[PDB]
Amino acid sequence: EVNLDRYQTALEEVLSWLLSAEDTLQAQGEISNDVEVVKDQFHTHEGYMMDLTAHQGRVGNILQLGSKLIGTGKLSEDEETEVQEQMNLLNSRWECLRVASMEKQSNLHRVLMDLQ
């Protein structure tokens, strides 16, 4: 029961962080025509990908905890359904950010190999 609570506490935290990191990526806007802003944008996004990587460990940890909870057989019908929906969401929201962050990294690095 404390498992099911420690899990759900980490889930809201990572999930919230995930909406925030989306927020951040979608505020960044467009890559600069100015090679000077671009380099800044590039070195900023590299700290973003460092941050991404660390939170990738948290997402997996919650995926492990969630799964094992299901696996114990010790969850009720509803409890299981919910842990199941939560991991869909965690999987899908993570992958959506992870892909856009990788695009951005590529577009940023490509536009600097060009211009800088």
Author numbering: 338 to 453
Sentences copied from the publication:
Dystrophin is a large (427 kD) multidomain protein expressed in skeletal and cardiac muscle where it binds to the dystrophin-associated glycoprotein (DAG) complex of the plasma membrane and to F-actin connecting the cytoskeleton to the membrane. Utrophin (Utr), the 395 kD autosomal homologue of Dys is widely expressed in non muscle tissues (reviewed) but is restricted to the myotendinous and neuromuscular junctions of differentiated muscle and is located at the sarcolemma of developing fetal muscle. Dys and Utr potentially act as cellular biomechanical shock-absorbers limiting damage to the plasma membrane with the spectrin repeat domains acting as spring units by undergoing force-induced unfolding. Dys and Utr-SR1 adopt the canonical spectrin repeat fold comprising a triple helical bundle displaying an approximately cylindrical structure of overall dimensions ∼60 Å length and ∼9 Å radius (between backbone atoms).
The Dys N-terminal (repeat 1) spectrin repeat (Dys-SR1) also crystallized with two molecules in the asymmetric unit but there is no relationship between the two crystal symmetries. Based on sequence analysis Dys repeat 1 has been previously defined as amino acids 338–446/7. Comparing the structure of Dys-SR1 with Utr-SR1 results in rmsds of 0.8–1.9 Å (112 Cα) depending on which of the four molecules in the asymmetric unit of the two crystals are superimposed in a pair-wise manner. Dys-SR1A and Utr-SR1 (A & B) form the more typical conserved interaction between W354/W324 with helix B H392/H362 and helix C W431/W401. Instead of forming the usually conserved interactions with H392 (heptad ‘d’ position, helix B) and W431 (‘a’, helix C) Dys-SR1B W354 stacks against R395, one helical turn distant from 392, and is associated with both a twisting of the bend region in the centre of helix B and a crystal contact (M387 distance 3.5 Å) from a crystallographically-related molecule. This disruption of sidechain interactions relaxes the Dys-SR1B main chain so that canonical helical main chain hydrogen bonds are formed in contrast to Dys-SR1 monomer A and Utr-SR1.
